[PDB]
Design a binder for these strands. Structure first.
Ligand SMILES: Nc1ncnc2c1ncn2[C@@H]1O[C@H](COP(=O)(O)OP(=O)(O)O)[C@@H](O)[C@H]1O
Ligand SMILES: Nc1ncnc2c1ncn2[C@@H]1O[C@H](COP(=O)(O)OP(=O)(O)O)[C@@H](O)[C@H]1O
Ligand SMILES: [Mg+2]
Ligand SMILES: [Mg+2]
Ligand SMILES: [Zn+2]
Ligand SMILES: [Zn+2]
Lengths: 282, 565, 621, 267
DNA sequence: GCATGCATGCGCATGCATGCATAATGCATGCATGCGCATGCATGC
DNA sequence: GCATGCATGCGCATGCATGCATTATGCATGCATGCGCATGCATGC
């Protein structure tokens, strides 16, 4: 009849998905104990208790995962960005499995932050060079500055000027990365006149927000070379990692070595010697 | 406005309630039996009467009348929910579509745990698994409307119309829901259709393809798709309802699965339908805004004794007309002023399948058939197939029409070979013709009746008295039964025994001998014997006898003698 | 848009002026009863005389003619106010009411050829013929949608031609919720209005000879959808505006001009009761005598024409049988016996009269035709002369020159009154109930007395039986008859219209006596006025008489007597054969005479008059 | 915009619930005398105990604490209805009335250091000291103009923070007629409302020793303009919302969070 | 009381996140009408 | 009645006015803070 639009539907199906399934089985199966006294389900019970108490975070030791299956542990050491997402989805699915009979009304299943911990000996901050980009590194230091906690968006929704149509549930990228709005209104309009150029506005009240913090880390005075100025580093903290460190503490931090991504902006200032340099962080 | 849940519950209880009506004189659970049959493939569509609902709640009926489509969907969902309760056994024999439905339900039970979260897009479309259709019957209190007066006030309502059929479309499948398979996954994608045209999809919305970001591409399938039977109908007003000096108006109807193949061109029909628009996108127009075209969606389509007692006299001609109607070609030639046209009009009105032509108005393309945007549409001779055709002022027709009529009478098929048309048409119809005062009529036709106006005083006075009675009291001096009697009569087929042949043979020979004695006689041939045999068989059929008898042969001989004299 | 207006002197004053215009309390105005009639009839528009407005308030009329849209808006607001005042309940049904216009516009009375840009944005009047029409289409005004996901219903309002210029923000159909939940359209709750487009051409009679015609395009709104049809002569009053083209960068600077109609017009008790009850027979006596003073003598033809004007009675029965009720006449005479004058007078007097000479119209243009529409590929029906003249009169001059096939075609109309049409793809039965006048010259130029009428007429018996009456007229050169004819002709010639100076270039029941048009001797009698004659004819045509038992046997016996006298008439020949149609003709003429004098039943005198007519017409010396 | 809403179960039910909450006929409630006091004092806002609402209707309190804006709108509508009911004459003066909140919020009692994105779009309570204040500035709500050329007056309505997101079509000051005749602004007939901005810091007595302080920014509307001064210890209850940045192509994805006060208390 | 220390205080430079300003051309579609063809109607002789 | 004339009628090509579709990058401005300077206050001896 040319008026309605019922949409699109699909049905459940009859290698990354297999990786997520492997992580889920690891979480549901892992146990620690003895043959004499049996074994206890470490991560299952831990996730159950944390979700029940309201703490949306768990900590995973890489040695346990390597014991369970070395392939996934080796994978996490090389491409943390994707396998972290897969492991978080597996943790969310397990938490849904264990705590199905929740109190009424609170049906919404929230995300879960997965932290990492290992017994590997650290390495000097001076060893950070080009070869370690996008890998997982462990570094000691002393914290000297900590900015205020701010808000950063993970899901956004935008509206059109003329026809007031909406694009919803757009996923933002983690880290210090931006987003560019589209310029064309994607609506089929025949006979109707069309929308202008650049018609989109960001709706603030319909976005998902998380905590955000930046830290300044200095090389340990115990390991600074004689007669050399100490070096510094900038750290990114998200969600539950905020407020865990006070300036002046001596900390060991495991993270990913990255660069900021805010587009191909032109260099500024009266000095323009450097070409193709992106500010780095962890 | 009222919540749909309460009315859905009311619909369910109404379907579960009624016990009242039974044909055999009892109290029978009708809707329960209908639902039990619906559980398996013993019934593939259900019709709901809005007169039975009126007993308990008329506001439901009014809301159904004004908002018919929403209530149709609600009824469909309610019946689908009720179906599992009434089911008692698995299908004894099932076809391809049932095999898909069973397999999909089985794997849905296999995979989906009761507690896992399911996206609103992850469900099956309602109409894909459904295999039964619901239609409504117009209220008896509701008065049928006229094609001319349905307007914007009637868009979206439930209406009942009566009209004449002029155009019918051949059956073709119509898409309901399209099924897609991804290039790199086992998932299935469903696309509902509610538009005259649609744009096929490309990428796969399945969860696995999304998680892997594989970029798999969809492909259509025809086996998994759902198709329905679709037909297009054209209707016109009766000549009675047209105002002064105007022309009949037309409307367009769409016809669904079981309602398909009910109506034929030239039939008078009553249609219960919903009046809905179609959004039109195309050539630019003068006035801005949203215009639309209207059309009708159907849910139900519904289609010796005295012959012309108003006309005085011609009793033997009336008997011959009765025999022609009953069956096993009659021509009348008369002076002007004798009502020959009115007999043909009565014959046209009485016959189930009939056509009536007046002369050059229906000449040429009005007969035979022609090609129109391509489909071939027939004329009066084609429409009257297996019926009776009536032609007035036969002698004034063009020669081509007369040749076509002769071909229909003798060969019973039409052959057309012209630029763009090369066909043979089946016309198994008997012809009644009228004319004014030739060897062609005697040789080709079976029975000729010559009506000569001899001015006898007594006959003229009686005719005047009868006409005055008709004009004054509007009724003759002291059809459904006739139609039923003819229908019952035509069911049987008598047979000719071996012995009577000799008698018949003798008669024929003697008749021809007399015709050879009277040199003024014109025609006797085996065609006359065939006509006599056919008339005797028709009379035996009237008596419902298995074996031809003597009285039928005598009456046929007497009728032929009266016609010839 | 939050912009609002607080004060406007002109609009408020104009609204006040219309409020005072439509009060009708201290005046003899009628508009109050008009509004009450509109409420009674459920209609929602009014027609107001422009001359009346100018008489009451000339400035408002000047402003309305010079400026249309704002003044029309003020009119509609005032109508809403007064409809609410008289009955606020009825005003709830309709959004806004409308105003029609009527009266002599004067200078603005403009032909389709003389419409110019000088009259833009004003109200104009135009007279023309209709050539193109389009199918009726609905248009959305208010839309309603429902969301099964959230159980919420919303409504959107549309206003496209209400505002002069529209923008892409409006006229957008909603399909999705704020959270992308699908919406289901609910057609029952929406609001639609009908729309049609027609084309009008300057009438060929008015256009200068040898020049191509010019046309205007008209848009018909919801109320005026079915008020026009192709091939019709109409007068349209409405606004003349420009058409906004759709968005673009470069424009040539040429707009399209479209007339938006507001009014469409099809151009056209005690006294009667007393006169009828007192006169009875004298009713038809005077009506026959006073039929046309311009024509001398011929009482029988005047009686027959009056019988056509009154006519018979259409009858139907249980079996669907139809019985004809119309009358048909054929006149044959020598030249200069004023047959064409009679035809022209019947054209002038009869309500629906169409003249169609012998070779002027062919068989296709008489009844109807079927044409394949190139725009859609469908088949459409075009009505001919006889279908247009339903329950009317068709006059055929020079009937003898008509071809045989056309007469065979006319047979269908003359016998049953219907036309059957069929071509592969469509078939119909159109109504064509009608009456026919025909005048035909004799074959030998002048009627031969010695030869029998059959040789002179030269027509078959079937066609003669189709006609109810045959009349033969002769120019006998009697000196006294010639003197009378000369007196009458020169009296009519010397007459001049009263109120017109000599030498210049160029209602009472009974007409005032005239010295020349009537004469000194005729002072003892009077003639009936034309207007009362038309009113009485219409009233008589409405009346439905019934046949009595006294006259049926009498008429049947006389029909048998005629069919036996067929052998007795030895001294004279017969003009027309006697068939079964003669009895129906007798009954029809009896009923026509019973219509002439308003009563309830058919009496013996009407039968006697019918039989006198039949005897006179059917035999000649 | 011609779009309208016909039915909404949640909003209508919430309005009915507040109507029953503020009746005080068959109960020992006091809000009727509070409304009479407000009418007597020409003030146009009310303060309602959160604990009282939770005791009478726990579900409404839960929804209001978890979702602020819609529930506050329903409160304001109910106040308008009851002010019209008791005395319709007084309700003519003001466009819409406002609601304050009071009582023990419990878990939502939050220090400026512990405000997080978890409490966004909810009503929060904060205790702090005032450090920065700004001058009071008027803001236009309804504008009125006059045309000496045509002797016509027009009025334009403005609504910026009433709606979550604003567009360039609105917030445009008219200066010319449809035929380019100049318009003269008439400041007497227009409508303005006052506006102020303050900053609140966590009290040094409460902050952990040796750590830098953290602060929040507050916007004070027309009624609460003069209720705060620098160097003062206050408690503020109000909504915690994001701030819409002006139009642009590329966004970094970091919003600004601003607390919009509804109640300010001098402890 | 005079000599000295010094926590407070002020004005102009650069660095960096947000924010502001710019801005016709080419290609597609439906309406009007010519040109070849076959059917069919009407008109003579 | 048969032979001929012919006004009507239909389908596919091109020509021409309106109408439709497309579409990121570079430069400017205000907030934060270092560095040199002079006044002035407070603290000793
Ligand atoms: N036997 C009859 N009985 C009654 N009416 C008759 C009879 N014969 C003729 N008529 C009347 O005479 C009229 C004959 O006209 P019609 O039947 O058209 O003649 P035809 O068919 O020869 O052209 C009809 O209207 C009919 O009413
Ligand atoms: N009876 C009459 N009375 C008056 N005028 C007559 C009469 N008969 C003939 N005429 C005159 O003779 C003329 C006849 O012309 P017309 O009616 O064309 O004759 P026809 O129609 O016979 O060819 C008319 O102009 C009319 O004035
Ligand atoms: Mg006939
Ligand atoms: Mg004449
Ligand atoms: Zn848009
Ligand atoms: Zn797939």
């Amino acid at each position: 009849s040319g008026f309605d639009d019922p949409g699109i539907f699909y049905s459940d199906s009859f290698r990354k998905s297999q990786l997520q399934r492997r992580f889920k089985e690891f979480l549901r199966q892992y146990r620690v104990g003895t043959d004499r006294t049996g074994f206890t389900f470490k991560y299952r019970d831990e996730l159950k208790r944390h979700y029940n108490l309201g703490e949306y975070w768990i900590e995973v030791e890489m040695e346990d995962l390597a014991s369970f299956d070395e392939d996934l542990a080796d994978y996490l050491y090389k491409q943390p960005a994707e396998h972290l997402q897969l492991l978080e989805e597996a943790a969310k699915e397990v938490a849904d499995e264990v705590t199905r009979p929740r109190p009424s009304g609170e049906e919404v299943l929230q995300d879960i932050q997965v932290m990492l911990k290992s017994d590997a000996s650290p390495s000097s901050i001076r060893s950070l060079k080009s070869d370690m980009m996008s890998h997982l590194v462990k570094i000691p230091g002393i914290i000297i500055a900590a900015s205020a906690v701010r808000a950063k968006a993970t899901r956004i929704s935008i509206q059109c000027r003329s026809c007031r149509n909406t694009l919803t549930n757009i996923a933002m990228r983690p880290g210090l990365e931006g987003y560019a709005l589209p310029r064309k209104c994607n609506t089929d309009q025949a006979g109707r006149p069309k929308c202008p150029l650049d018609p989109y506005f960001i709706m603030p009240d319909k976005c998902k927000c998380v905590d955000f913090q930046t830290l300044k880390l200095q090389e340990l005075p115990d390991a600074v070379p004689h007669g050399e100025m100490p070096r510094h580093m900038q750290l990114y903290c998200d969600r539950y990692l905020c407020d865990k460190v006070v300036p002046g503490n001596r900390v060991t931090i495991m993270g990913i070595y990255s660069i900021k991504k805010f587009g191909l902006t032109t260099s500024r200032g009266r000095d323009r010697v450097g070409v193709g340099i992106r500010s780095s962080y962890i | 406005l009222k919540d749909y849940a309460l009315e859905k519950e009311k619909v369910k209880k109404f379907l579960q309630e009624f016990y009242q009506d039974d044909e055999l004189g009892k109290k029978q659970f009708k809707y329960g039996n209908q639902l039990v049959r619906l559980a398996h493939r013993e019934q593939v569509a259900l019709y709901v009467d809005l007169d039975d609902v009126a007993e308990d709640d008329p506001e439901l009926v009014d809301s159904i009348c004004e908002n018919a489509r929403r209530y149709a969907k609600l009824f469909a969902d309610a019946v689908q929910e009720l179906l599992p309760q009434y089911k008692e056994r698995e299908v004894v024999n099932k076809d391809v579509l049932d095999v898909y439905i069973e397999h999909r339900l089985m794997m849905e039970q296999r995979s989906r745990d009761p507690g896992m979260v399911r996206s609103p897009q992850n469900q099956y479309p309602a109409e894909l698994m459904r295999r039964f259709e619901l239609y409504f019957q117009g209220p008896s209190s509701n008065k049928p409307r006229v094609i001319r007066e349905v307007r914007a006030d009637s868009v979206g309502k439930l209406v009942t119309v009566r009209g004449i059929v002029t155009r019918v479309s051949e059956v073709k499948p119509k898409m309901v829901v399209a099924t897609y398979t991804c290039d790199q996954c086992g998932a299935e994608t469903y696309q509902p259709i509610q538009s005259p045209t649609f744009m096929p999809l490309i990428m796969c919305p399945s969860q696995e393809c999304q998680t892997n970001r594989s970029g798999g591409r969809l492909y259509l399938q025809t086996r998994g798709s759902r198709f329905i039977k679709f037909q297009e109908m054209k209707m016109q007003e009766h000549s009675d309802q047209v105002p002064v000096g105007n022309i009949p108006r037309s409307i367009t109807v769409l016809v669904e699965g079981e309602n398909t193949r009910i109506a034929q061109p030239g039939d008078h029909v009553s249609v219960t339908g919903i009046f809905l628009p179609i959004l039109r996108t195309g050539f630019r127009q003068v006035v801005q805004g949203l215009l639309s075209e209207t059309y009708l969606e159907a849910h139900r389509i519904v289609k010796a004794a005295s012959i012309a007692p108003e006309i005085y006299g011609h009793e033997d001609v009336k008997k011959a007309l009765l025999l022609l109607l009953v069956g096993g070609n009659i021509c009348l030639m008369g002076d002007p002023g004798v009502a020959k046209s009115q007999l043909l009009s009565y014959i046209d009105r009485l016959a189930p399948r009939s056509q009536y032509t007046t002369g050059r108005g229906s000449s040429g393309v009005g007969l035979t058939a022609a090609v129109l945007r391509l489909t071939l549409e027939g004329g009066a001779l084609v429409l009257a197939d297996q019926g009776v055709c009536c032609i007035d002022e036969f002698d004034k027709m063009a020669e081509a029409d007369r040749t076509a009529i002769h071909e229909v009478m003798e060969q019973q098929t039409i052959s057309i070979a012209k630029a763009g048309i090369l066909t043979t048409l089946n016309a198994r119809c008997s012809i009644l013709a009228a004319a004014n005062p030739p060897a062609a009529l005697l040789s080709r036709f079976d029975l000729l009746w010559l009506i000569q106006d001899r001015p006898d005083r007594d006959n003229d006075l009686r005719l005047a008295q009868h006409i005055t009675y008709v004009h004054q009291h509007s009724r003759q001096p002291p059809m459904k039964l006739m139609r039923r009697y003819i229908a019952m009569c035509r069911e049987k087929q008598p047979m000719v025994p071996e012995s009577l042949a000799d008698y018949i043979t003798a008669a024929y020979v003697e008749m021809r001998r007399e015709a050879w004695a009277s040199k003024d006689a014109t025609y006797t041939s085996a065609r006359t014997l065939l006509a006599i045999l056919r008339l005797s068989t028709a009379l035996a059929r009237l008596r419902m006898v298995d074996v031809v008898e003597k009285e039928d042969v005598n009456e046929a001989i007497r009728l032929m003698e009266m016609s010839k004299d | 848009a939050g912009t609002v207006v607080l004060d406007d002197v002109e609009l408020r004053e104009a609204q006040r002026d219309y409020l005072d215009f439509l009060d009708d309390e201290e005046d003899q105005g009628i508009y109050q009863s008009k509004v009450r009639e509109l409420i009674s009839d459920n209609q929602y528009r009014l027609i107001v005389n422009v001359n009346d407005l100018r008489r009451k308030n000339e400035k408002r009329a000047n402003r309305l003619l010079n400026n249309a849209f704002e003044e029309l808006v003020a009119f509609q607001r005032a109508l809403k106010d007064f409809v609410a005042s008289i009955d606020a309940t009825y005003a709830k049904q309709y959004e806004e009411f409308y105003v029609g216009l009527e009266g002599s516009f004067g200078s603005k009375h403009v032909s389709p050829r003389t419409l110019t840009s000088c009259f833009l944005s004003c109200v104009v009047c135009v007279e023309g013929i209709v050539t193109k029409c389009s199918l009726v289409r609905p248009k959305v005004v208010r839309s309603v949608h429902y969301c099964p996901a959230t159980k919420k219903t919303i409504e959107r309002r549309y206003s496209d031609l209400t505002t002069l210029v529209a923008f892409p923000s409006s006229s957008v159909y909603p399909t999705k919720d704020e959270e992308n939940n699908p919406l289901e359209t609910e057609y029952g709750l929406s609001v639609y209005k009908d729309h049609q487009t027609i084309t009008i051409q300057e009438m060929p009679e008015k256009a200068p000879a040898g020049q191509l015609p010019r046309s205007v395009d008209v848009i018909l709104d919801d109320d005026l959808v079915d008020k026009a049809k192709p091939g019709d002569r109409v007068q349209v009053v409405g606004t003349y505006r420009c058409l906004p083209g759709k968005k673009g960068g470069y424009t040539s600077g040429t707009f399209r001009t479209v007339l938006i109609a507001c009014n469409v017009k099809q151009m056209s008790i005690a006294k009667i009761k007393k006169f009828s009850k007192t006169r009875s027979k004298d009713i038809f006596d005077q009506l026959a005598k006073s039929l046309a003073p311009s024509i001398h003598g011929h009482d029988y033809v005047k009686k027959a024409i009056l019988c056509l004007l009154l006519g018979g009675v259409e009858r139907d029965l249980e079996n669907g049988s139809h019985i004809r009720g119309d009358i048909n006449i054929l006149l044959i005479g020598d030249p200069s016996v004023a047959k064409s004058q009679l035809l022209r007078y019947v054209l002038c007097t009869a309500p629906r009269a169409i003249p169609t000479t012998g070779r002027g119209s062919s068989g296709v243009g008489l009844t109807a035709a079927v044409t394949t529409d190139q725009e859609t590929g469908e088949r459409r029906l075009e009505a001919g002369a006889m279908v247009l003249a339903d329950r009317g009169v068709v006059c055929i001059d020079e009937f003898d020159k008509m071809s045989d096939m056309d007469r065979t075609a006319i047979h269908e109309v003359m016998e049953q009154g219907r036309v059957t049409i069929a071509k592969a793809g469509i078939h119909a039965r159109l109504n064509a109930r009608c009456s026919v006048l025909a005048a035909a010259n004799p074959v030998y130029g002048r009627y031969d007395q010695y030869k029998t009428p059959m040789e002179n007429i030269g027509l078959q018996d079937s066609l003669l039986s189709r006609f109810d009456l045959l009349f033969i007229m002769l120019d006998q050169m009697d000196p006294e008859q010639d003197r009378e004819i000369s007196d009458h002709v020169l009296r009519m010639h010397r007459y001049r219209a009263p109120g017109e100076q000599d030498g210049d270039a160029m209602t009472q029941i009974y007409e005032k006596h005239d010295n020349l048009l009537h004469g000194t001797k005729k002072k003892k009698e009077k003639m009936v006025s034309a207007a009362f004659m038309k009113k009485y004819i219409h009233v008589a045509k409405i009346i439905k008489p019934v046949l009595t038992q006294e006259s049926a046997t009498y008429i049947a016996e006389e029909y048998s007597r005629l069919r036996s006298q067929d052998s007795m008439s030895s001294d004279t020949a017969r003009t027309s054969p006697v068939t079964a149609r003669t009895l129906e003709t007798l009954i029809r003429l009896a009923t026509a005479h019973a219509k002439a004098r308003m009563s309830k039943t058919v009496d013996l005198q009407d039968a006697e008059e019918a039989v006198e007519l039949v005897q006179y017409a059917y035999f000649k010396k």
